[PDB]
Structures are given as C-alpha cells and as structure tokens.
Symmetry: C2
Subunit: 83 residues, 2 copies
C-alpha cells in the first residue's frame, strides 16, 4: 500500500535534527524522501507494523508526531507542486 509519512519535529536542536536523520534513514528503505520530513513509501501491512514499531522508538512522543496518509493507486496522478 502507498503510505505518505509526515514527521513533525523541531529541527532547531541538534537532537531534533538527529531524530529526523534516523526517521529518514528508515523511511527511504521503503520509498522516497520528497521533502525534508515527508516520505512517499511503499509497505506491506507487516512492514507497516514493523515501521510503526521502530518509529515509536526513534521519535520523542511527547514533542514529535507522525501522521500516515494512505493514498490509493493513481496517487502520483494526484500530486501537484511549487518550489
């Protein structure tokens, strides 16, 4: 299934920026980093449970948040850009 991962972390600190690097390291195994903290990923349901599980341990859950959008097929024909 396609999954868009949007990670909200405060990059004004070294530790923030380091968690971003880890989250990115993890998500790019499963697809592509299209902005600094946005990822277009391709995962089986087992992989998705595994990813959730590892993301939990990387992120600071009190300050950070991750959202997952499950778009269908023809999701590429449904993205537009600027910049």
């Amino acid at each position: 299934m396609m999954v868009l991962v949007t990670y909200d972390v405060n990059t004004e600190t070294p530790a923030g920026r380091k968690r971003l690097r880890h989250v990115a390291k993890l998500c790019v195994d499963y697809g592509q980093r299209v902005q600094n903290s946005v990822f277009e990923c391709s995962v089986t349901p087992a992989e998705f449970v595994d990813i959730k599980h590892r993301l939990t341990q990387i992120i600071d859950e009190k300050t950070d948040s991750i959202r997952f959008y499950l778009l269908g097929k023809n999701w590429q024909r449904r993205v537009e850009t600027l910049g």
Copy 2:
C-alpha cells in the same frame, strides 16, 4: 474537495519562521494546521486556484517547496498517527 498541503521550509532562521507563519495564516482559512507545516484543506476548484497563486508569491521558490495531495473522499478513513 480535500487537499493536503505540506510545506518544506527551514525554521532555524527568523525568515523561514516568518514564511511558515504566513503560509499558516493563508491555509488556516481553508482547513487545519494538523502539524507545524502540514495543513488539511477543504476547497472549491476556484479557491484552490487562488490559493496556489498566493502561496507562490509567499514562499522562497529556490529553497522551499509545497506539495498538494488531492485526497479522495473518505480520506479520513485513511489517516493514522503513532
């Protein structure tokens, strides 16, 4: 129609934080700031065109980017959080 807007800007400088707030002020007219630089928007075709126009002026096109994902209806049945 529902559109997800994701804005990539560097917020370690005042100039980036300004641009983000300005994008925020615009996008919040049409939906919600679900995370610091992500906005879930509800828009007519005409609203979508005018917004795209103004975002274009606001952002630094060389160092920033905006992605608009058109969410299908019942897109809410397909969002999860950790």
